[PDB]
Amino acid sequence: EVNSFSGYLKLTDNVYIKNADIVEEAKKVKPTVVVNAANVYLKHGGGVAGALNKATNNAMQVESDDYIATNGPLKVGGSCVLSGHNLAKHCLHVVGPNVNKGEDIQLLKSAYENFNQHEVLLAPLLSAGIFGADPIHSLRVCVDTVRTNVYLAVFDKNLYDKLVSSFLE
């Protein structure tokens, strides 16, 4: 079956959320698009990007280095479409701002706007974790910006509960 997402909670007509590891979701669902929480040089050294790359047995990193050689780095707020490998048909590498490294939080709207070029996506919560954005703010920007169908996988039950409670206020 195609895009067989299971156990998500529907927040709006186009945003769904689950307490799950995005890697495990991608292996099970094999969505049309999986979003990577990338950096501008597509160096998948840890966190979500390192976990997605390891699940491809480093094929994503080799492909990413070849893309950077020919095209140069992305911009913060920008994206590129590369292979999904064994995880999806495509991987949309999206650069959210890293607030802990001084980048502008307003670029989070530009980052989520990349999602609107794809009908259905499996994605992480952009700029959360060690990128330093307030995760409740990142969910509000996602809900206000994305118009296509997005399935958010958040791998932390404590944060999942805080995000759902924050949305349902």
Ligand X SMILES: CC(C)[C@H](Nc1ncnc2[nH]c(-c3ccnc(OCCN(C)C)c3)cc12)c1ccc2c(c1)S(=O)(=O)CCC2
Q: Which residues bind ligand X (CB under 6 A)?
A: 21-23, 37, 47-48, 51, 124-125, 128-131, 135, 153-156, 159
Specify the residue, 21 or 69, whose C-beta has the smaller distance to ligand X.
Answer: 21
Please report, as a single letter, which amino acid is at residue 166: S
CB of 92 to ligand X, least distance (A): 14
Residue with tokens 């597509």: 42
Residue of 129, 62, 144 lying closest to 96 (CA atoms): 129
Provide, rounded to whole angstroms, the least separation between the CB of residue 33 and ligand X: 15
Q: Look at residues 132, 70, 71, 130 and name the one whose alpha carbon lies nearest to residue 107.
A: 132
Least distance in angstroms from the C-beta of 51 to ligand X? 4
In the complex, the smallest distance separating the C-beta of residue 116 from ligand X, rounded to whole angstroms, is 19
Closest distance of CB 153 from ligand X, Å:
5
Report which DSSP code applies to 14: S
**Cα→Cα distances 145→65, 90, 114, Å:** 30, 21, 10
Cα–Cα distances in angstroms (integers) from residue 39 to residues 75, 97, 110, 145, 159, in the given order: 9, 9, 14, 21, 23
Cβ distance to ligand X smaller for residue 51 or 92? 51
Q: Which one, 11 or 153, has the nearer CB to ligand X? A: 153
For residue 48 the two structure tokens come to 């979500």
By beta-carbon proximity to ligand X, the closer residue of 47 and 78 is 47
Cβ closest to ligand X, residue 70 vs residue 94: 94
